[PDB]
């Protein structure tokens, strides 16, 4: 049927869309900063403060899986990572800086992205 085609068609364009936001934000980052989960070892009270942990790995993982239905969940897991950050970091460091930075380059790319949802008519 049309409507099957038409719901097939809005998730292979959101699923395009959300790949090259997240390339954009990924290549914001050549310093991997925010590319993996922060080990353990490295920062063993990370878990104590940052009860949600978030990373550019885990939302490959779930965009290419399927697991992303619209451009809000993917903007929650975006503002996760920049959020963590901050509330981790003391503001006077290199990774909090960082998250500011990609916060406000992240914040254009996703604005153009919701003019894209409204453009196509994804959702």
Not at 85 to 101: G, L, Q, S
């Amino acid at each position: 049927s049309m409507e099957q085609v038409a719901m097939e068609l809005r998730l292979t364009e959101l699923t395009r869309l959300l790949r090259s936001v997240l390339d954009q934000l990924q290549d914001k980052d050549p310093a991997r900063i925010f590319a993996q989960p922060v080990s353990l070892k490295e920062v063993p009270d990370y878990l104590d403060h940052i009860k949600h942990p978030m990373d550019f790995a885990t939302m490959r993982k779930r965009l290419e899986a399927q697991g992303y239905k619209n451009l809000h969940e993917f903007e929650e897991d975006f503002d996760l990572i920049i959020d963590n950050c901050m509330k981790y970091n003391a503001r006077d460091t290199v990774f909090y800086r960082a998250a500011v930075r990609l916060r406000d380059q992240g914040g254009v790319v996703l604005r153009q992205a919701r003019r894209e949802v409204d453009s196509i008519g994804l959702e």
